[PDB]
Please model this.
Amino acid sequence: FSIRDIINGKRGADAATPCPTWHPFACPSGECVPIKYLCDGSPDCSDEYDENKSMCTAATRPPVEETQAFLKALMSAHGKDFLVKVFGPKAKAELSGMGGVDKVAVALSQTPTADLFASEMKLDDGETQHMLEVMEGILNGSTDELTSNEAADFRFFVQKLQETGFF
Amino acid sequence: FSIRDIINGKRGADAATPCPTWHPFACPSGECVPIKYLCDGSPDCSDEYDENKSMCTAATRPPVEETQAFLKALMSAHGKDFLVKVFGPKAKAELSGMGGVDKVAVALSQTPTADLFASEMKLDDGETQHMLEVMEGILNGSTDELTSNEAADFRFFVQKLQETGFF
Ligand SMILES: [Ca+2]
Ligand SMILES: [Ca+2]
Model:
């Protein structure tokens, strides 16, 4: 009772022979691969899940539950509408127009670029451009948009976006 | 982070569906964790599979299958008894007395130290000491046991063992 799997076959009886410790990663296609083969620029799993772009981008960024916590702590320190200063009015009321802090944490973890993030979140041209200008300004030490404490709390996170190809 | 996943409840031990892209690694206990939480010194699976010592050793060493192809290439180039020069007489006839090339390649990948490898392969004290002397000689450029060409073929592999705690 699993979609993909119906059409390749059906194992033994019972199900489980999980992966060995030396090839500990199970692909949906049901091959076992070494951690080294994940995100290595070539497909080791027949379904190519080992090179899944969402999985490989998330592997480069903070774990989603740390980003969730981090978004929540900025709004607790700076206000429930604080993230309007970065993403525009869809960020008001604890990211209510962007699908909530859980959906935003996953999107910032998995989405390779600001452009693909903007499109998922339905930001217009002006909101996307302002998001990039604020994030460049946070890296600069600029306080045109954020206060000094706001920029310092955000700086390390924006640095990691930039080191991982977001902008 | 997944609205689908709330309303099926508890991810059993195991299968049915796969772990999401942001927490792609499945513990046998049925938890899903980020790659970054593997081998990080604290348990994120309730069964501590993320800190499993064999898994974590193997993740620092060449993949199983490369080590296996490597040992087979050494014995095709240098003879079916070539690895007697490292492991002693149990290595004769393509590692017959050590359970064969697949078992030796798994043991070299996932055994933390030369002493634990020796005890599992049932090498005696004399054989263990000579193995360590030969491996040191390979790092040195000594040709007392291997030719220049044999040692050149083995040197990177011996360095990967030294760098990952083997001796
Ligand atoms: Ca790969
Ligand atoms: Ca861990």
Chain A touches chain B through 32 residues (CB under 8 Å). Chain A has nine helices and two strands. Residues 78 and 147 of chain A are 10 Å apart (CA to CA). The two ends of chain A are 41 Å apart (CA to CA).
